[PDB]
Design a protein around this nucleic acid. Structure first.
Ligand SMILES: [Mn+2]
Ligand SMILES: [Mn+2]
Ligand SMILES: [Mn+2]
Ligand SMILES: [Mn+2]
Ligand SMILES: [Mn+2]
Ligand SMILES: [Mn+2]
Lengths: 163, 163
DNA sequence: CAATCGTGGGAGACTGGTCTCCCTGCAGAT
DNA sequence: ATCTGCAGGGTCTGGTTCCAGACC
DNA sequence: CACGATTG
C-alpha cells in the first residue's frame, strides 16, 4: 500500500507512494539561522512535523530513511549536521505515526544497479524519472537529486523494479 | 507555572515543574545498539515520545533545552551524537505541543552562580538538592548530575532562586 | 537562481573582546 | 552497578568466523 | 554529506 521515503539532508526530500501508484515528493523545509556570526541552513522542525501531519499516508506506514554515514574525512560540523538531521527526521516520523526503517545508501544503490557511477546524482534522477515518469518535470535540475533519492528510497521499500 | 527542562545527552534527563511547586525528573530513555561491531547507547525515540505524551503539562508549555555546543577538540562522534540527541529531543518536544527554548549552559550556570567550579557536577547536584529538596534522594550519586542539570534548567525557566 | 569547486571547519554571552561552556567512546578500577 | 581516566575515534553490506569494496 | 566560496 503506502510507502514513505526520506533523504534527510538539508537539500533532501520526502516522497510518499500511494497504493494506486501515484506519488508525491516534497523538498525538505529549511530556515536560515545565525551560528557563530555566519548564516547556516537548517531543517525547519515545525514545517516538517506539519508536513507529516497532513499526509494521507495512514499510521503505521513505513518510512525508509537513509542511514547517516558521514565519512571520516568529513569535518565535525558535517558529522553534527548529519547527526542532527537524522534525529530530527526520525523523531518526527515516529511522533507522526510512522514506523521508521533505516536503509544504507549502498543497499538501495545496489538494488537499482547504481553502484560506482562517474555521475551518481545524474543517474539517480534518471532512475527516478523512469520509475516515476509523472515526476519527470520535477527532476530536470541537478539540485533535484534529493527528490530522486527520496523517491528511490520509497521505490526500494515498495519493491518496484526498473524496466 | 508549568516548565519543562531537558538535558539532551545520553546520561541526561527531563524535568517537569508543575504550578503547585511539585516536580518530576526522568532519566533519558536509551537503548544499546550495534555500530561498527561495538555496542553504543543511543537515545530511545519511541520511549521519549511516549514520555512526553504522558506529561500533564499542557500544550504550549515552554521546554528549556541546553544548546548543543561541542568543543572543537571533541571527536567527530561527539559532534554527531550531540547533534543527533539535540534534533531528536527538539523534534520530539515540538511534535508533542511544547515550545522549545534553547538555553546556553553559560546562561543557567551564571544565573545560579555555578560558573567556574573545580567540581561542577557535584555543585549542580548540590544546587538542585536545594531548589528541589524532595529530589535529594535522587541526586546523591555522581551519575545523577544529568537529573541536576535538567532540574536546574527548568528552575532557570521558572525563575526560582537559591535561598 | 542554479551550478561547480575544494576541503573538512566552534559557539555563545556580556561596534570586537574576552571568556566559559558540552560531550562521546573506550579502557580500567572497585 | 558506580566511578575514574583520557583522548577525540567510520560505518555498512554482502560474503563469512575476518574481508573488500562501497557510501555520505 | 557540510561549509564558504565563486561562477554565469
Ligand atoms: Mn542522502
Ligand atoms: Mn547534493
Ligand atoms: Mn541527498
Ligand atoms: Mn548538558
Ligand atoms: Mn555525566
Ligand atoms: Mn548532561
Amino acid at each position: 500500500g503506502w510507502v514513505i521515503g526520506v533523504d534527510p539532508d538539508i537539500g533532501g526530500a520526502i516522497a510518499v507512494l500511494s497504493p494506486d501508484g501515484s506519488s508525491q515528493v516534497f523538498d525538505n523545509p529549511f530556515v536560515h539561522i545565525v551560528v557563530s556570526e555566519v548564516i547556516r541552513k537548517r531543517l525547519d522542525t515545525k514545517s516538517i512535523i506539519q508536513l507529516l501531519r497532513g499526509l494521507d499516508a495512514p499510521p503505521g506506514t513505513t518510512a525508509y530513511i537513509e542511514k547517516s554515514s558521514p565519512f571520516p574525512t568529513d569535518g565535525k560540523q558535517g558529522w553534527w549536521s548529519t547527526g542532527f538531521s537524522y534525529g530530527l527526521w526520525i523523531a518526527s516520523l515516529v511522533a507522526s505515526g510512522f514506523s521508521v526503517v533505516p536503509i544504507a545508501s549502498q543497499t538501495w544503490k545496489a538494488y537499482f544497479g547504481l553502484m560506482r557511477s562517474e555521475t551518481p546524482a545524474d543517474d539517480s534522477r534518471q532512475a527516478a524519472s523512469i520509475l516515476f515518469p509523472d515526476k519527470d518535470q520535477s527532476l530536470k535540475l541537478k539540485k533535484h537529486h534529493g527528490r530522486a533519492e527520496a523517491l528511490l528510497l520509497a521505490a526500494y521499500g515498495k519493491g518496484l523494479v526498473l524496466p
